[model samples]
Target chain A: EKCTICLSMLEDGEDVRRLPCAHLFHQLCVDQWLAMSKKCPICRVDIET
Target chain B: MALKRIHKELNDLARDPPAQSSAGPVGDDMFHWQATIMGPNDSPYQGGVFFLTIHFPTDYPFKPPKVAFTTRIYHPNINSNGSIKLDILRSQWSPALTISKVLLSISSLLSDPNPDDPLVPEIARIYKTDREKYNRIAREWTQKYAM
Candidate 1:
């Protein structure tokens, strides 16, 4: 079935790191994020750094 | 436009491996994927190799995929059967993310489980107070299955 994909599920012992739009992913996930794209995967948020 | 872009990024990441330690369908079908995650150390999931099934819709990139654990895991946010409480995979999804990004997100979830909004409150409580024991169980599962 088609499932929803919006907010991220941060695993245990993880902290929330925000995108420029303030949506959060794990620090490791977002670190890998900045390497891939400049925009937030969720909400299409933009980050200049 | 979003689906096309996400598809394109999926292809790119497949061609170039990221630094993270994980494995997935590199050239498999674009819509569905089987992901393997290595548990994070110093956490409850360390040393485990967990399996997840990711099902993407025809209108992906605008939507997120349905991800569930095939293995049985005990966590506050994930169900006993390994289904997790991920926002992107449920509500609050947008059309800007690629499969690569989503996979990475899942990997992070492996190491750090969120108890703020948990699916299993019992596990959450254990996670809150006695983390060392909780991690030990998670690690046992990880070492048995992940290694």
Candidate 2:
């Protein structure tokens, strides 16, 4: 799949984090995405800090 | 980093602009954009074009962009000064909410005024008790300013 924020492809085994919402993205991508808002980018479920 | 995201957003918007709305940087500054939302059909704001100013914070994507109407609107949710009172722009904002979504919400707001939780209580009262008068005034204002 692709990182929605950066619009970059995410390969398996890449540095990734899965939110409680079950959505995954590159670790680097999701980290910055979490800083501004703690909600899942795809479903908006609250992310535990 | 913010610039990268802003550039990507601009590109995405260009590739597939949102319906009834258009947005782009005001000048060389990518952080500041000018946007327009066509008033929703079948609303008091119909046939009007509403302008808006969008200011992206340095920490965007994590923070919601600041949006305000530049054109005067006669609605309970929008003040005469053009400021909007929408929860999605404030407390309920999410990182996934893009500028296009924001404009879409504003367009919907024009069609469905949240009179119960209004920025202008007087207008809300009029909207609730005498909707015809409210619509008339809103349409008059739209023609006077937004047209």
Candidate 3:
């Protein structure tokens, strides 16, 4: 799968983080995604962390 | 990180080019791009092809890049200088958004304008009170400059 936010291709790694919806993204990519909007960019679910 | 992300986006854009719009870097400068958006068929701006210039900042996706029209257009939210007044381009931008999404929004704006928040007040006023005349002029300009 691809991290749509940063368009980075994904694979299991130290930086791969999964959301509650089990969507995966690069650590830096998801971190910045959450920092800016605090919602799962894929599902638009409100998040606490 | 910025360069890495931008490179990924360029590849993604190539993999799945969006409808009515396309963008790519100018020459070998990854920071600069040229974009195009076709006029919405449902609106008076139909049949026109608008051009835009893009400059990615060093902190892109975190900070919004600069985008402005190079093609002349007549619209309430877009000024004569090509500066657009879309909220997402400025205060409402999110890293979740991409240039592809931005161009889609611009296409929507061509179909449905937000005159309530306008950059050109005179155009907004005409759009509100005399929509027929506004459409005529908008269509005329679309033909005059963007056809």
Candidate 4:
């Protein structure tokens, strides 16, 4: 699945983080997302910063 | 990347539009949008239809969109210039929030004005002490400008 933050195709072998909500996103994308918000984009579950 | 997310949001909004409000691109430029908000029932702003301008940053979703009223509204949190002082549009913004959600929040604000934290202190005072008078002016402004 594409990263919801950047809305771009996630490349194979790209570094990705799995939120406690079980959603996946590229590390860069999630890093930026976390900077602005602590909740998962797909589901608003609070993620550990 | 910004346009991609915008396109996705447009599709989602089209498929499942928000109740009492509608938004879409102003022209071919996907970065700018025009939104219409129906004043919430049981509020001073009732019977009013407000318009808004939405501008998305190039790094949207990571950054909150800028939303401002284009239509005049009488509310404590909204200034005469149509600029709104909403938390979600400011420091408390989240990437999960969308334009539809923002519009809904504005409607909710109309339903429940936050007098304590207000942009217009005079309106807030009237809202706190003389609600009937406050409602009267709000209604008059709505009829004069928002109708």
The TM-scores of all predictions, comma-separated, are 0.66, 0.90, 0.87, 0.85
- In the order shown, the candidates' DockQ scores are 0.15, 0.51, 0.47, 0.48
Query: Which DockQ value does candidate 1 get?
Result: 0.15
Query: Which regions in candidate 2 have their CA more than 4 angstroms from the true location?
Result: A33-38
lDDT of 1: 0.63
Tens digits of per-residue lDDT for model 3, B1-147: 667777878898999888799899987898898899999987999899999988888878877779899998999999977999888788777666788878888888888999999999999999999999999999999999998
What C-alpha root-mean-square deviation, in Å, does candidate 2 show against the real structure?
2.1
lDDT of 1 by residue, B51-135 (tens): 7777777655555677778767766777877787877676545454555566667666656778778888887888878988777
Tens-place lDDT digits, model 4, residues B5-98:
8898899899998878989999999999999898899887777889999999998877878888989888999997788888888866766567
Candidate closest to the true structure, highest DockQ: 2
Residues B1-147 of candidate 2 have per-residue lDDT tens digits of 568878988898989988789999999899999999988999889888899999999977667788889999899999866889888788777666678888889898998999999999999999999999999999999999988
The sequence of per-residue lDDT tens digits that candidate 1 reaches over residues A4-47 is 13233565666556667766666554554455556676565568
Candidate 2: clashing pairs of residues: A36-B62
For all candidates in order, the CA lDDT equals 0.63, 0.86, 0.84, 0.85
Docking class of 3: acceptable
lDDT of 1 at A32: 47
